[PDB]
């Protein structure tokens, strides 16, 4: 099963920078969402969930087809809460209806990371909307109530190694859990991209507890929380070494996250030899906007 990237007809870097800017301007304008966290974190999560359905074995799922727009995927219990990100992107799509759905969802995540002061994430266009019967079944996204062995095995399906996994999980510094979405709650909240996930793992005093949804989670007396899968990154000795590396080197974390996140968003896509080079978008700040 081959998905060849096909550039939206007549579009170039400038066209996509305009879409980036519209997303970024709306992030600034709709600042009140989720108790003033804003839409940044949920857009990052949306980009990951549309990509994380991928299966390397048969090239099903992945970001290419934009299939989150169909009810089966939209209503995946694993995707509860992401409807907010979809609703955010709706007026963007109306302003730029030429962009494919997969390109819009993935660009939303890139824009959110960069506007939240994260690393630059190179991004490629050319995802093409595929029909409803290409939507992956529910159940391909990861469970949170598991251990390091589960995490490691799960991410092999996405062709991610230990370093890539630990780097990607640093996104859990962003946003927060919501009891009504996932059965996890707490840990305060944040909308600036940093390496604080790793610092909190290492520096906080953690205690395993059951929450009000009867689910296990690790809680600190500072009020932070870790999922069992988050905490597994310091229980496993191979993950722990990488956690320490990122806790002690902000730039290295940024660079490795950028590579892993681009890879995540591009898994399953075949790019022609003469496809455009990846785009690196300027932030609003860099443009004086
Ligand atoms: C073992 C892997 C993972 C598990 C089990 C997991 C699980 C979860 C859960 C349960 C939530 C709470 C959702 C809610 O209640 O609204 C969440 C939120 C979030 N996840 Fe993950 N996740 C994983 C990997 C990732 C990755 C790889 C990324 C991105 C690179 C990511 C980005 C996010 C973000 C940004 C949020 C905050 C969303 C918001 O504030 O609305 N996660 N995740
Ligand atoms: C601040 C914060 N953000 C997240 C995102 C996902 C997750 F599972 C936990 N998180 C915590 N504690």
| CATH class of the 142-260 domain in this structure | mainly alpha
250-266 vs 101-115: helix crossing angle, rounded to 10: 170
Cα(123)–Cα(31) distance, integer angstroms:
25
Cα(25)–Cα(182) distance, integer angstroms:
29
CA of 126 to the centre of ligand 1 (A): 26
- Residue 170 is classified by DSSP as G
Same fold, 1-141+261-289 and 142-260: no
Residue 127 marked ligand-binding: no
Residue 49 marked ligand-binding: no
Q: How was this structure determined?
A: X-ray
Is 129 in contact with 63 (CB distance < 8 Å)? no
CA-atom Rg of the chain in angstroms? 18
Three-class SS of residue 220? Answer: strand
For tokens 């395993």, name the residue.
Answer: 208
Closest ligand 1 atom to residue 44 Cα is: 35
45 touches ligand 1 (CB under 6 Å) = yes
Q: What is the dihedral of CA 126, 132, 136, 142, to 10 degrees?
A: 80
Provide CATH code, domain 1-141+261-289.
Answer: 1.10.520.10
Three-class SS of residue 216? Answer: strand
40-51 vs 83-95: helix crossing angle, rounded to 10: 90
Size of the chain in residues = 289
Q: How many CB atoms lie within 10 A of CB 11?
A: 18
Is 66 in contact with 79 (CB distance < 8 Å)? no
Please state the φ and ψ torsions of residue 254, each to the nearest 5 degrees: -55, -45
Three-class SS of residue 166? Answer: helix
CA neighbor of 201 nearest in space, from 237, 173, 180: 173
Per-residue b or e along 133-170, where b marks 16 or more CB atoms closer than 10 Å to that residue's CB:
ebbbeeebbeebeeebeebbebbebbebebbbbbbbbb
Which residues, 6 or more positions from 76, have their beta carbon under 8 angstroms from its beta carbon? 138, 139, 141
Domain boundaries in the chain? 1-141+261-289, 142-260
Cα(275)–Cα(103) distance, integer angstroms:
15
225 touches ligand 2 (CB under 6 Å) = yes
Cα(10)–Cα(12) distance, integer angstroms:
7
Cα(176)–Cα(224) distance, integer angstroms:
10
Is 102 in contact with 65 (CB distance < 8 Å)? yes
Is 51 in contact with 265 (CB distance < 8 Å)? yes
- Strand 216-220 relative to strand 225-226: parallel, antiparallel, unpaired? antiparallel
Closest protein CA for atom 10 of ligand 1: 182
Closest ligand 1 atom to residue 151 Cα is: 1
166 touches ligand 1 (CB under 6 Å) = no
């Amino acid at each position: 099963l081959v998905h060849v990237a096909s550039v939206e007809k007549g579009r170039s870097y400038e066209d996509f920078q305009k879409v980036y800017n519209a997303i970024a301007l709306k992030l600034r304008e709709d600042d009140e969402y989720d108790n003033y966290i804003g839409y940044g974190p949920v857009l990052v999560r949306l980009a990951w969930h549309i990509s994380g359905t991928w299966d390397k074995h048969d090239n099903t799922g992945g970001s290419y087809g934009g299939t989150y727009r169909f009810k089966k995927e939209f209503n995946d219990p694993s995707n509860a809460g992401l409807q907010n990100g979809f609703k955010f992107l709706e007026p963007i799509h109306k302003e730029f209806p030429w962009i494919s759905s997969g390109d819009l969802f993935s660009l939303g995540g890139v824009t959110a990371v960069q506007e939240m002061q994260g690393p630059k994430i190179p991004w490629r266009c050319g995802r093409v909307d595929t029909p409803e019967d290409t939507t992956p079944d529910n159940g391909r996204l990861p469970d949170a109530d598991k251990d390091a062995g589960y995490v490691r095995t799960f991410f092999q399906r996405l062709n991610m190694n230990d370093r890539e996994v630990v780097a990607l999980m640093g996104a859990h510094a962003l946003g927060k859990t919501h009891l009504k979405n996932s059965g996890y709650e707490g840990g305060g909240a944040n909308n600036v991209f940093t390496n604080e996930f790793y610092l909190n793992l290492l520096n906080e005093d953690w205690k395993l507890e059951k929450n009000d949804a009867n689910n296990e989670q690790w809680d600190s007396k500072s009020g932070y929380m870790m999922l069992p899968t988050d905490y597994s990154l310091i229980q496993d000795p191979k993950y722990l070494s990488i956690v320490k590396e990122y806790a002690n080197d902000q730039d290295k974390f940024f660079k490795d996250f950028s590579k892993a996140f681009e890879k995540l968003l591009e898994n399953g896509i075949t790019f022609p030899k003469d496809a455009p080079s990846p785009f690196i978008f300027k932030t609003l700040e860099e443009q004086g906007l």
